[PDB]
Ligand binder design. Structure first.
Ligand SMILES: CC(=O)Nc1c(F)cc(C(=O)N[C@H]2CC[C@H](O)CC2)cc1O[C@@H](C)c1ccccc1
Length: 127
């Protein structure tokens, strides 16, 4: 069994900025989800080897996780808030695509996604 390389968190070629919205996505959104009792399965890329999910990276071709998002935000990797919001939405969607309703991992994704939606609802206007 083999894991793919993780998503890119560094790329000098890539245009990037700090925006007040991306600052909010780190200080408020990432921080809120990261500290949650259900955060731990999402704090690093899915280890399909250790979890014995040999089909995971046959089904999930756009993997994403909060470990990757944390590194992208800390490295100021993003151009805009929408790129980062897409990463969160990819993470949740992947969980729902691979797993089935009522699975513990899905209940955990649903709890995190509720908070995500509550926080992004108050994403500030761009400065
Ligand atoms: C980020 C993510 O989603 N990870 C993750 C996953 F993709 C799949 C499974 C998993 O075992 N799915 C099975 C459900 C039942 C089906 O019949 C067969 C597949 C577990 C996962 O997380 C572990 C740490 C976990 C394990 C237990 C509780 C919470 C998290």
């Amino acid at each position: 069994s083999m894991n793919p390389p993780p998503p890119e968190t560094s790329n000098p070629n890539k245009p990037k900025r700090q925006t007040n919205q991306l600052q909010y996505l780190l200080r408020v959104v990432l921080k809120t989800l990261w500290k949650h009792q259900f955060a731990w399965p999402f704090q690093q890329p899915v280890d399909a080897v250790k979890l014995n999910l040999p089909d995971y990276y046959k089904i999930i071709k756009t993997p994403m996780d909060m470990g990757t998002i944390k590194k992208r935000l800390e490295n100021n990797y993003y151009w805009n808030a929408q790129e980062c919001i897409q990463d969160f939405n990819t993470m949740f969607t992947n969980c729902y695509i691979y797993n089935k309703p009522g699975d513990d991992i899905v209940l955990m994704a649903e709890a995190l996604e509720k908070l995500f939606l509550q926080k992004i609802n108050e994403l500030p206007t761009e400065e």
